[PDB]
Amino acid sequence: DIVLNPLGVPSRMNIGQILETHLGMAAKGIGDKINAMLKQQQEVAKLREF
Amino acid sequence: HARSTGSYSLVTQQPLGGKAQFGGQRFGEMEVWALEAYGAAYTLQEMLTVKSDDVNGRTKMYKNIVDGNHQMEPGMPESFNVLLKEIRSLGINIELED
Amino acid sequence: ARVTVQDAVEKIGNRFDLVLVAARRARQMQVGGKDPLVPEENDKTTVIALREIEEGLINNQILDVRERQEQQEQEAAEL
Amino acid sequence: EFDAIKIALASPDMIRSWSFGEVKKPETINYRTFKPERDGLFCARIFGPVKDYECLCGKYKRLKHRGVICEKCGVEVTQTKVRRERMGHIELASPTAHIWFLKSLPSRIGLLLDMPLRDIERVLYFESYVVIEGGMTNLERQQILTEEQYLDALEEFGDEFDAKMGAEAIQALLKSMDLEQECEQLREELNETNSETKRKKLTKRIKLLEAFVQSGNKPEWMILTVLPVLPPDLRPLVPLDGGRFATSDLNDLYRRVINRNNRLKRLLDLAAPDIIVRNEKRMLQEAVDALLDNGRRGRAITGSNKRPLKSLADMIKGKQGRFRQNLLGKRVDYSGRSVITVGPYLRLHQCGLPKKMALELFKPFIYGKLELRGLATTIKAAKKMVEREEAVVWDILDEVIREHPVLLNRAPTLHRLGIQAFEPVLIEGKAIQLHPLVCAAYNADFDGDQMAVHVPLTLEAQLEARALMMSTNNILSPANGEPIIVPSQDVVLGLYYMTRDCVNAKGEGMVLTGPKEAERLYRSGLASLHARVKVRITEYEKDANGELVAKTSLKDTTVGRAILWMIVPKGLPYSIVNQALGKKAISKMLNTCYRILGLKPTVIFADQIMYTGFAYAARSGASVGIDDMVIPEKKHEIISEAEAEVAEIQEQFQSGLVTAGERYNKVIDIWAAANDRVSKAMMDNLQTETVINRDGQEEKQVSFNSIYMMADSGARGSAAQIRQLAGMRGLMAKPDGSIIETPITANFREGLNVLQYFISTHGARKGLADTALKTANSGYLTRRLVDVAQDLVVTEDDCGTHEGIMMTPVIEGGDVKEPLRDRVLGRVTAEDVLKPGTADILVPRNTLLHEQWCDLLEENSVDAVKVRSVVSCDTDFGVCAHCYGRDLARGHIINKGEAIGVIAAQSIGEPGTQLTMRTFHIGGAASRAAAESSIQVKNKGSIKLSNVKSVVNSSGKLVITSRNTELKLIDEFGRTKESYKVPYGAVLAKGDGEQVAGGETVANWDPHTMPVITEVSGFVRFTDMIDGQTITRQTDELTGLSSLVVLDSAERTAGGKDLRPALKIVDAQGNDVLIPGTDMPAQYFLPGKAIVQLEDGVQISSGDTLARIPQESGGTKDITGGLPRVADLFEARRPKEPAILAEISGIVSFGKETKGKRRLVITPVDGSDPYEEMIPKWRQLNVFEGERVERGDVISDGPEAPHDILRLRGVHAVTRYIVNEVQDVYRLQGVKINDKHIEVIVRQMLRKATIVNAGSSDFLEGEQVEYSRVKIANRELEANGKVGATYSRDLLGITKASLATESFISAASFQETTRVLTEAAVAGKRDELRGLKENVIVGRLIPAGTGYAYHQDRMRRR
Amino acid sequence: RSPGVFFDSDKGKTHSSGKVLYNARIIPYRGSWLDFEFDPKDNLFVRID
RNA sequence: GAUGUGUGCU
DNA sequence: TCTGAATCTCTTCCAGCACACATCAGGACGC
DNA sequence: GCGTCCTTCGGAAGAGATTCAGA
Ligand SMILES: [Mg+2]
Ligand SMILES: [Zn+2]
Ligand SMILES: [Zn+2]
């Protein structure tokens, strides 16, 4: 959805954006796993475990 | 924002300031230095007379531009007449010499 | 049909007299009915004046002598 | 039309001549039907009719009655625009003092009547009397009497003897004063007196009197009798919503003045008691003084909410006056404003105007073309058609905009490249696209900033925009010969990723048959971009006389370099892309391409470089993750070791071995040691620690770590940022200057504690505030520089002089700071240089040293040349082209008629502003140097010392015992290759005459704790030092050893001020020891903050540390703190402790001892000997009674004053000193400025010359008159047989050198408008509209560029 | 600044010789000020407003 | 039109 | 006790452009 | 509502006015 510029990270040391990027990628991965396990009808056991 | 020939101020016949009213961007004191550095005298002369304080030259330039003719006949900025009157309002006497 | 004018500056070497010469020529080509000596390519008068400068057949001396021979022809045309 | 402007005082007759009526009622518009009152401030009878061509009563309505005057109300009918060109006047009841000529410092009335300002003000505000025409009494014409003394005068001298008060008394004094008799009496007094202070006072008064007599002015005109009023339309009362009116201030002040004047006139006829009418006259005087210049008195009057309203002077002076707000800079039609975006598809000469903005900008052109094509009929129809935005107005807009350039200007226009001209390209949107290359020149990022687009209207403006201001003609920075359109931060990364090799490939050993085949191979996915191949290439070369001869070979390169070579123009050697192209490499590539091929191939090359950088940067995906910032593994180990050392030192502190001094110093130093070890481990693990397989075994290479890639390429980042990301952050100090004991050991790859972040916030906030509230001074410096040098233009071609300054490479402590090539490129030489085949010339006398000749001198290893300089030029009112040098924006001589004085001022003034608005880009790091302590000679060669005084020590080695010692290394060839500036107290390993091998010291010293090391041995007795009064003594009771600390001028006792702490040396018999060869006793003064660990009456050696002094040399040394130095040099402030020089050469001696301070007399061997100077007893005089001193030799030590250098060592020495100091300040920050600009500013500083003797000329004796007039007068007189006038060049700072110019308009528009206009009006000065600011103000063509020809024709027509 | 008394320093640049003065400002919540301060000649000068 | 506040890019 | 040198006091200066909003204009008294 | 009217708080530098001290 958006293509930023890498060179804006090292000169102005706001490394928090890259860590937020990685953490948001992990969060969206968890959300995608939940959405995949919820799209095909699966019982509450697998969802609760995950 | 952009501004062609529009509305002008009252005390000095300059274009208004701002986007709310139809106003033109200020050609500041630093930009005049940059125009002098290039040596562009005609550009500077049009910048401070014919699209600015001058009244008769401004209308003549407008007619020339919508006449097919790119030519300016500037007079004197009205902000200089304002300065002369404001100095003469004191005890000083400043005037032009033939 | 014009990007930079370095060669035209080489033709008349002041870079300030070039502006005045091109202004005189372009004003003659715009207000006056005078015709360009090079084939115009849907360009403005200033670009054509600069290009005629770079073609070599125009300068301040040439403009003055052309204007003066036109003036003497005009004076003789009164009869 | 006209050619000059004259300014003088206004007589009441002239004021009545200006006026058309006399306002006598304080009635504005009547809060009713918007009609002027009968005789009010707005009056149709006096100024003019309100509506156009309509009489106020309404008896006439059309032009058919123009010129006639009505009968019922008597308002003449004409255009309504005469309401802003016709003034009135107020007949004041009593005379009133003009505040400008009362409080201008000096008060003109004050030194014209020879009275103090207090007495004249007391008279002028009705609190004392003054005596005019005392007569047969003992009261003088200038004596001041109070109320009771006037009562005594009336009872004791109740004759016709008169003594008035108020403004009328001063008017009578001025009117009844003769000027010629007073002037000749002052001449007699000056010629008969002998002192200097009264001489200055009398010459000031006689200057004022001669100015008054010469002009047509009158002293009695300073007191107002008629007060003119501003025209109504220049102080408009605009009606708003409601019955009220605008909060006008001039109208309110006029209301107050007219009310008070009418009240005074009423009371004059009512025969009111003298006290009441006196008070009312005082109130009228105060009101008039408030109208003229409000706030010049004690308290200013205010209209509402205690806001001081603006008087007439308040709208002529200041930043919001008619000069700096409406004349020097104006709001401008055909202008636009919007946000900018990139759009890298453009070319170097194009920008993107929004389609809905160019319709508004080029609107009259659209009207004209529509009327030409017949689609419209009148202006109204075309206007309606355009605002309706039909289907054909876009097809007409594409014709008015085809080749009509526009000017894109960013808001802070620091240097002249901030305004450039682009050919527009219409786009759909609302953002002005801007070519990515020119962002460096504009300093325009794309994070929300806007640019202003202007439309050149006339034909000449378009031709100037295309020929001068087009971006394709601005590829060279006017500040220095470096290119300004350099790839920045993405093209650099693209060309660095493309032109780089790793030891492996998709296909490595394959051999290619051309760059085209290399591109075909890469795009097909058959070989990686970083292969190591042997491609066959054809590199052209123009080594002949402009002929391109090709040579094909087979070079070992990469695929990426072969691809990039395809866009390089024919004419460049191939050893320009066959490397790892960073940013300096690309800049040098563009510079060489511009110097070799020209301008058009350079523009084409820049566009192709940008395209192929963007493409192959996108095809690389050079991201940045969190694994790229690799923290070195040996980081917490270093932290543990350093913390163990810190704990050991902390424990030792409690043992008493180390105090809270050296312990703090060593703990800071060991933390810094750990910092550099961690950073070195990080930067050794980051780049070379990348094991890759050769396909036979492993080996190392340069890393592809993306952080290191964009740090090495020079795209964005530096060593500091990578150190703060992967290593440790550093030592963030406190705002006061105390470095924090525990530096931040965490970086922005791990976290930061709740406390380390708060520590960093101090530095971050100071770095953010420094920009915001300290770019003002750096932007005021450039304004002063522009205003002092606005009137400099190249008005000749060759002044024809053999003079000039000497240029040599600058080496004062390290390697080559700037080689000769940088310091001499593009500057015309003055004398034939000689190779080491001397008496054989190498260059002609007046040849421009361009690039070829400038490397033709490095081949011959030339060390010094004499080149023509701006400061030493000879032409009048200008600078000849040859005396200037290269244009620095084009590769040739500067063309005649160019305003170099502004190109110099902007170039000097915006490394400062740019680097102070960018301070917080690096954060808040100190960036302090290492404060080195050893001198290691780099090359092998002879050693030579100049003006160094060294002594013998216990070990027999020479030790520095001078303050201005200079160590220089000279190689075996015979040239200076290295120099060193060692401090006082430096020990030496080798001396003079013998060569020193490389890798050993020649000079060692301790930077801290400078000593007072002696030269002769003997016992010590403390002279003029007693405990408590001048020194504080502390003694340990165990060992009983004394320890004393000296005091400064602060805590020194009032009775102890005359006490001078020092040290004297005595022998065993108590006699005074002597230095060998001299008779000066060993009286070594002890400066402040000195710590002495020695005892009284002990034996010492010769050359031992007598005392130790802290140096307190701690500072960031950024361009924020580090640029009052530039302003100090330019304004030329005398330093706090100036170094005393010698005024005259000859034999030196000493005169009257202890005349308050020591005295020294210099007696020439042959000439007269009147010179004696009283040297203060502070510092040691380096000259004794056995040497001969030449003028310019330093009697004392310390910083030089940039007036003594000019007076004694000449003009070349002072201009070289200023250039060297300013250039050192700038080079400390890494910014580059060519010295021509600083020399130009120096020349503009040197324009006032003081006359010594008039000779045969017409100049005065001590007058400070402009240098050009003196020079032309001397050239005219010496052409005949008469003798000239001897002068003396004076140095004025850029503020005073601008205030004291010939044209009063420039000084009035620059600074101190009141003090300049008052002096010009008193002196009756006559402007000439000579420079550039005057013509800008008036509204004419400047005599600078394309208008220089017009101004030359105008001058030659008369 | 809270009403009360603040003994400032005016350190450094005053007197152009290095002698640091001392001042004692008495700021009330409402009313006039009572600035006490020293002199380079060791004299106490009251300064009302 | 002038003040007062807030904000953007240097 | 005349007169340079030091000191005290008053004035001038402190960036460039732009945008948004609000408030103001005599308010105190006579009718 | 219409309408006629009489705080203090920076700092740096420079000029120009006063005072010191000293021969
Ligand atoms: Mg920005
Ligand atoms: Zn009438
Ligand atoms: Zn010259």
Side-chain angles (χ1 to χ4, degrees), chain D residues 1056-1077:
Chain D
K1057 181 60 64 180
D1058 276 356
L1059 278 70
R1060 286 294 303 266
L1063 297 181
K1064 277 191 62 58
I1065 309 299
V1066 292
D1067 50 10
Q1069 59 173 340
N1071 199 321
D1072 312 330
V1073 305
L1074 83 167
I1075 319 294

Side-chain angles (χ1 to χ4, degrees), chain D residues 1187-1225:
Chain D
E1187 306 85 10
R1188 207 201 71 86
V1189 53
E1190 184 259 342
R1191 51 184 306 181
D1193 295 314
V1194 269
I1195 300 304
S1196 177
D1197 279 329
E1200 303 128 339
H1203 308 98
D1204 304 1
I1205 312 181
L1206 173 62
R1207 192 186 66 254
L1208 305 175
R1209 312 181 193 180
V1211 178
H1212 306 291
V1214 56
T1215 191
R1216 181 177 44 85
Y1217 166 78
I1218 288 184
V1219 163
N1220 286 139
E1221 293 290 343
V1222 177
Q1223 201 67 27
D1224 185 288
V1225 174

Side-chain angles (χ1 to χ4, degrees), chain D residues 796-801 803 868-870 872-875 878-884 1243:
Chain D
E796 283 197 3
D797 205 341
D798 198 1
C799 72
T801 51
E803 207 180 344
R868 305 174 59 172
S869 180
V870 181
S872 73
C873 186
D874 200 16
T875 177
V879 161
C880 77
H882 282 70
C883 248
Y884 182 79
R1243 170 181 179 90

